Amino acid sequence: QDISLSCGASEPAVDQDKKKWEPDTKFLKTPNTVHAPATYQDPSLLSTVPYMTSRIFTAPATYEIPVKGDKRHMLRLHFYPSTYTGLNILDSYFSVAANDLTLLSNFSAAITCQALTQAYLVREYSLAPSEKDVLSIIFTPSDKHPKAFAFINGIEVIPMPELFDTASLSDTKTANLQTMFRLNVGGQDIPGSQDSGGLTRTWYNDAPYIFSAGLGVTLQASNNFRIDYQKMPVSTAPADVYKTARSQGPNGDINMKSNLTWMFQVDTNFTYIMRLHFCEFQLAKINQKVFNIFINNRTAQGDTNPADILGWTGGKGIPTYKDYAIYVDANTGGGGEEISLQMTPSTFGQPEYYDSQLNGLEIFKIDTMKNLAGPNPKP
Ligand SMILES: *[C@@H]1O[C@H](CO)[C@@H](O[C@@H]2O[C@H](CO)[C@@H](O[C@@H]3O[C@H](CO)[C@@H](O)[C@H](O)[C@@H]3O)[C@H](O)[C@H]2NC(C)=O)[C@H](O)[C@H]1NC(C)=O
Ligand SMILES: *[C@@H]1O[C@H](CO)[C@@H](O[C@@H]2O[C@H](CO)[C@@H](O)[C@H](O)[C@H]2NC(C)=O)[C@H](O)[C@H]1NC(C)=O
Ligand SMILES: *[C@@H]1O[C@H](CO)[C@@H](O)[C@H](O)[C@H]1NC(C)=O
Ligand SMILES: *[C@@H]1O[C@H](CO)[C@@H](O)[C@H](O)[C@H]1NC(C)=O
Ligand SMILES: [Ca+2]
Ligand SMILES: [Ca+2]
Numbered sequence: 001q002d003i004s005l006s007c008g009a010s011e012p013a014v015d016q017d018k019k020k021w022e023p024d025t026k027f028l029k030t031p032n033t034v035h036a037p038a039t040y041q042d043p044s045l046l047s048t049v050p051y052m053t054s055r056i057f058t059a060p061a062t063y064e065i066p067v068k069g070d071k072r073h074m075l076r077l078h079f080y081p082s083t084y085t086g087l088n089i090l091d092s093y094f095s096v097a098a099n100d101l102t103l104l105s106n107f108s109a110a111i112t113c114q115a116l117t118q119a120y121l122v123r124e125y126s127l128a129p130s131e132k133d134v135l136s137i138i139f140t141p142s143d144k145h146p147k148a149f150a151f152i153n154g155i156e157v158i159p160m161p162e163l164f165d166t167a168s169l170s171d172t173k174t175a176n177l178q179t180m181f182r183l184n185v186g187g188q189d190i191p192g193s194q195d196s197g198g199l200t201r202t203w204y205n206d207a208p209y210i211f212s213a214g215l216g217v218t219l220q221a222s223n224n225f226r227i228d229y230q231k232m233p234v235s236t237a238p239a240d241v242y243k244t245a246r247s248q249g250p251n252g253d254i255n256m257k258s259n260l261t262w263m264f265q266v267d268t269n270f271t272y273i274m275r276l277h278f279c280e281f282q283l284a285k286i287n288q289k290v291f292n293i294f295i296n297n298r299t300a301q302g303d304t305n306p307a308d309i310l311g312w313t314g315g316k317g318i319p320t321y322k323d324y325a326i327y328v329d330a331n332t333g334g335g336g337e338e339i340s341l342q343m344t345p346s347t348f349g350q351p352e353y354y355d356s357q358l359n360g361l362e363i364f365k366i367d368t369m370k371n372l373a374g375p376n377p378k379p
Contacts, residue, residue: 002200003027003065003157006050008035015047017193019200024155030061038082042119050154051080051120055139056087057094057150063137071159073127073135074199077103078154080120081110087149093142094150095373098127098135101176105373106142109151115377120153124179124201125372126160126364160199161235164364167273167323168300177273178372180266180363183209185277186218187244187359197235206246206361211340212261217249219357221281221317228317241360242279242319252345252354259294259342260356267374268336270365271327274300276341277360279319280309287311287349291356293324294342296332300324306346309357321360339363 005024006013012022034056045051055061067073075098081089089110096104103125113121127135135157142148164172184190184203192200207215221243229236248255266272274295283289289309292302301307301322313320330336341361345354365372 005155006053007055007152007154008037008053009050010053013049015049017046017191019192021050021154024055024063027063027065028055028061029064033057033061034085036084038080038084040082042080042082044119045080050078054080054084054151054153056084057139057141060138060140061150063155065135065137065157066133067130067135067157068159069131069133070129072129072162074156074158074160075125075127075135075137076154076156076158077123077152078120079109079123079151080153081113084151091145091147091149092151093145093148095140095142097138097140098125099130099132100370101127101367102371102373103178105371106144106376107373108376111376111379114379126164126177126179128174128176158199161197161233163233163236164273167325170325172273172323172366176367176372178365180272180365181209181264181361183361184241184244185358185360186246187220187240190238190240194238194240196238197233199235203238203241203360206262209262209264210260211263212259214248214254214258214260216246216260219245219247219282225281226317227279227319228315230318232319236321237277237319237360241277243281245279245357245359247357248343248345248355255345255354255356256347259344262341262361264339264341264363265337265377266328266339266363267365269329270368270374271325272339273364273366274324274326274339274341275321275362275364276324276358277319277321277362278309278312278357279359280313280316280357283310284316285310288352289355289357290346290349290351291343292346294340295324295326296328296340302346304348306348307356
């Protein structure tokens with residue numbers, strides 16, 4: 001079952017999306033640590049749980065959470081940078097490790113939230129099977145900052161399926177991942193209560209990430225259309241991801257003159273998995289919608305093997321996804337902190353229409369040298 005801990009809470013509670021949270025107390029091994037309420041409630045909080053209570057650590061502190069050693073787990077860390085016991089939140093710098101994996105280092109939640117124009121954030125990780133029955137989560141105030149403290153508002157550990165296998169360049173089954181982005185392309189926001197697999201992932205509409213002048217056209221499956229998952233685990237992504245899409249639209253000439261373009265800020269010197277979710281719910285035949293996919297200006301799917309969703313799936317309403325790996329560094333145009341995803345029709349093989357489509361997108365950072373931490377953004 002899920003372990004969803006509100007750090008510093010004094011009693012169990014439920015949030016706005018029906019998620020049950022328990023106090024952290026029984027899992028925190030380090031004694032005599034401060035628990036404190038936030039003394040300001042940002043209007044953008046969707047709930048006071050778990051955000052209005054925190055732990056404050058002025059020395060290292062360790063949680064020990066029981067887990068099954070053979071299972072992958074999602075780990076979520078919830079941060080609400082605000083005022084706690086009168087401390088300056090800008091003085092908080094710390095690291096977080098999950099066993100031997102560094103998740104965060106020199107982390108400033110305040111600077112990160114300021115750069116995002118957010119009041120709180122969640123950092124989500126997928127941890128490979130550990131072969132240990134305890135997950136140790138260690139918070140370490142920065143020893144480079146005399147005034148540093150660590151803080152944490154909530155910690156979740158959720159067992160999850162082995163949803164990762166390989167990526168078009170690589171094996172990702174044993175990778176430890178950070179979730180960078182999770183989008184329901186062309187569709188509505190999906191709260192965790194509506195996610196598949198009991199995974200309580202949030203899927204966000206993709207419009208804020210579109211950087212082409214043309215926003216394309218959004219598509220929705222017919223009423224009572226059924227997604228026919230077949231061998232794809234339903235936990236991969238919920239049906240509303242596949243029942244909605246962004247396409248370029250009905251005007252093939254406009255489409256051939258543009259790329260549909262999404263842009264994402266990420267950390268340099270990592271490889272990322274771009275998981276593109278697809279489901280054709282309008283067309284019925286191969287070679288009707290055939291498109292090129294570019295990632296950071298390089299062909300991910302194109303030339304003589306362009307993307308054709310029905311080519312991949314064999315049928316209307318059958319979902320799929322394709323994983324593409326991209327290494328991001330400064331030996332690149334535009335500074336090494338971005339991923340661009342672009343689509344445009346292919347002229348290869350004389351398709352019936354000239355269009356492109358995407359139904360969902362997830363971007364995951366792969367661990368390097370047992371680290372996933374990047375720098376704080378510019379404020
Ligand atoms: C911990 O994180 C903080 C906050 O991200 C780091 O401080 C920031 O460090 C960056 C460099 O990565 C500073 O930017 C640089 O500033 C100088 C002077 O203006 C400029 O010459 C550079 O071109 C660059 O822009 C940034 O200003 C700085 N922020 C603050 C508030 O000082 C810090 O270095 C990290 N590590 C440690 C151990 O403190
Ligand atoms: C769609 O996007 C692709 C990928 O960014 C464009 O092709 C690139 O164009 C840039 C800038 O001229 C070049 O640096 C890359 O070498 C090109 N990549 C490839 C694989 O050709 C493509 O021309 C764009 N199409 C439209 C219609 O804008
Ligand atoms: C990225 O890698 C380069 C080359 O090793 C290094 O010089 C640079 O400091 C790295 N940047 C970050 C943010 O780690
Ligand atoms: C991709 O091409 C565009 C258009 O020429 C350019 O502005 C951008 O810097 C290029 N990006 C990369 C990552 O090379
Ligand atoms: Ca809390
Ligand atoms: Ca969708």
